[PDB]
Design a protein around this ligand. Structure first.
Ligand SMILES: *[C@@](O)(c1nc2ccccc2s1)[C@H](C[C@@H]1CCCNC1=O)NC(=O)[C@@H]1Cc2ccccc2CN1C(=O)[C@@H](NC(=O)C(F)(F)F)C(C)(C)C
Ligand SMILES: *[C@@](O)(c1nc2ccccc2s1)[C@H](C[C@@H]1CCCNC1=O)NC(=O)[C@@H]1Cc2ccccc2CN1C(=O)[C@@H](NC(=O)C(F)(F)F)C(C)(C)C
Ligand code: NA
Ligand code: NA
Lengths: 306, 306
């Protein structure tokens, strides 16, 4: 029993973190085989953040201008190139701790773990969702750039996020590991703002199923609803539409609890219209939307990773 | 900016997890140097859980009756002994991944990370507090016994918890790594219940400081209070007394924000008496008490570990 915001074990990623220094800027890089990946604005200086000419800044750098340290060992840079908003620094040593890995571009609504790092050293790990507005609600300080997000499946680390920017509402923006930003954001000091966010309905339903699995059932009512009638209510409360694909993805949780998805939707409708009236669900007084159906299954069935 | 329930990087502990099988029971063990630590009820059978005679059960086991596997490699057991509620299995191979480590008995109110494991394989990591009633609000399924809790300081892993039991309210009980239970609990199938819990006041204050650091300030009022008058209110709402030691431990956060502890206490008093009136603090509609002052400092200052 119990339900926690649980992150993936971080050890496979810890062995890949390095620090990259160029001039006065230091941030984190990801060392896989003989390549270090890091945000390209490691080459920027303070006066020139409004609209950096990255190609012009980089042509004045040579391999020796990049100082890469894995723990206390310097890694010699023997080549460099820019791909979208990342630098690829080729180094003279392949990381002996390189896990089996993939680069993935995740979809809004999916979750991942973040290994927050400073000066190439891990600080902590936590779980995040890719929000519908392509931001993440992270915990990042100065120096955290280049920290990565990831999922683990069996033995394979799927890297999905590299940290670049903090936006005005205290939320965060970054790229996939090919250096393409999630969302409309850019690596310049400009006016950029998160679009209006929405609530991830399929995840709220997954979490209500987690609550039932854990014995927290007070919110189940005797009614049902159609998908269309449910979505008219979801729309009013700034929830995203629920699709038939979402209903089918919730099938395993529906089968485990014996509660049809549309019956759970009827219970969620009443929570949206009436509130919780001072009660909690899984210890929260709000509806939680950063657990996917797969997250709930993993945590309520004990999925491990080699 | 941002504030998340952040766990320690788990890699140093991952390398220590093994599975222990005795008869039909399988659980997790902790492999440090040439010793594997695990809960002693790995030697129990289903019919004999009401009141096991552990000494009598163990005298009928030999080294070969314990099957210890580190990944896919069997570790030969060459000695065994019982210490309180744990078994120490001496093995023929010292763990080459043994970190610098300590065993610590933590105090109520302090936090730690849990590496939840099944069949010796890590599943996820999350942060827990030792509750005043000596339970933890974990997320544990069948097979999780022997999973450990820990803190990391610089390079040293301080192990503080090994998982044994689930109590009726869906909360958890376990031991330090010397096998002494936290709280009055025992490893038998009996009537045991968590005592009434209380809220960890110094942690709530730490979290209110985290909120201010992050720009969430609406709850700050213009008043102050004495320590005694504050504690009369805390008592009514089932908060633990705030001590002068607690006030001093909050000193760094008070200095960083410029808000005297007793002034923050005045703001907390008003939140207890009036509620939040529909507002959130750091994204929560409840007051959070599982961040210590040190946790807040770590997360809002970027402490890393080698
Ligand atoms: C990350 O650690 C980096 N810092 C630097 C410093 C100098 C050069 C390159 C880099 S990367 C840091 C992480 C931030 C820091 C604030 C606290 N929380 C975080 O997540 N990124 C950072 O400061 C980026 C880097 C960058 C790159 C190119 C142009 C401008 C900037 C500034 N920047 C921002 O995040 C800024 N936000 C925006 O401009 C906005 F997204 F449009 F809002 C800001 C510094 C937070 C205002
Ligand atoms: C842990 O994984 C173990 N399972 C077994 C099974 C056979 C032998 C030894 C062990 S250790 C398991 C973790 C639990 C399981 C339920 C779901 N969540 C968890 O955290 N521990 C476990 O089942 C313990 C082990 C034990 C040891 C000696 C006597 C009796 C038991 C049963 N037990 C309990 O946790 C039980 N709780 C209590 O008896 C109570 F604490 F008094 F409430 C119960 C099985 C949850 C009812
Ligand atoms: Na219903
Ligand atoms: Na005040």
């Amino acid at each position: 029993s119990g339900f926690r915001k649980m992150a993936f074990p971080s050890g496979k990623v810890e062995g890949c973190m390095v620090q990259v220094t160029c001039g006065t800027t230091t941030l984190n890089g990801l060392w896989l085989d003989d390549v270090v990946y890091c945000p390209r604005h490691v080459i920027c200086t303070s006066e020139d953040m409004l609209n950096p000419n990255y190609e012009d800044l980089l042509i004045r750098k040579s391999n020796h201008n990049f100082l890469v340290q894995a723990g206390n060992v310097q890694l010699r840079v023997i080549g460099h190139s820019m791909q979208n908003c990342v630098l690829k620094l080729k180094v003279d040593t392949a990381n002996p701790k390189t896990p089996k890995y993939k680069f993935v571009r995740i979809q809004p609504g999916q979750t991942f773990s973040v290994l927050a790092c400073y000066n190439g050293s891990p600080s902590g790990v936590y779980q995040c969702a890719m929000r519908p507005n392509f931001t993440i609600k992270g915990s990042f300080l100065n120096g955290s750039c280049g920290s990565v997000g990831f999922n683990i499946d069996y033995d394979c680390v799927s890297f999905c996020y590299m940290h670049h920017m903090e936006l005005p509402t205290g939320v965060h923006a970054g790229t996939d590991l090919e250096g393409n930003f999630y969302g409309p954001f850019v690596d310049r000091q400009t006016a950029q703002a998160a679009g209006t966010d929405t609530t991830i309905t399929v995840n709220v339903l997954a979490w209500l199923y987690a609550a039932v699995i854990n014995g927290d059932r007070w919110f189940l009512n005797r009614f049902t609803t159609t998908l269309n009638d449910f979505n008219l209510v979801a729309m009013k409360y700034n929830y995203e539409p629920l699709t038939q694909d979402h209903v089918d993805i919730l099938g395993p949780l529906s089968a485990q609890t014996g509660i049809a998805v549309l019956d759970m939707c009827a219970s969620l409708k009443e929570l949206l219209q009436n509130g919780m009236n001072g009660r909690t669900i899984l210890g929260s007084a709000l509806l939680e939307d950063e657990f996917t159906p797969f997250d709930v299954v993993r945590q309520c069935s004990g999925v491990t990773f080699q």
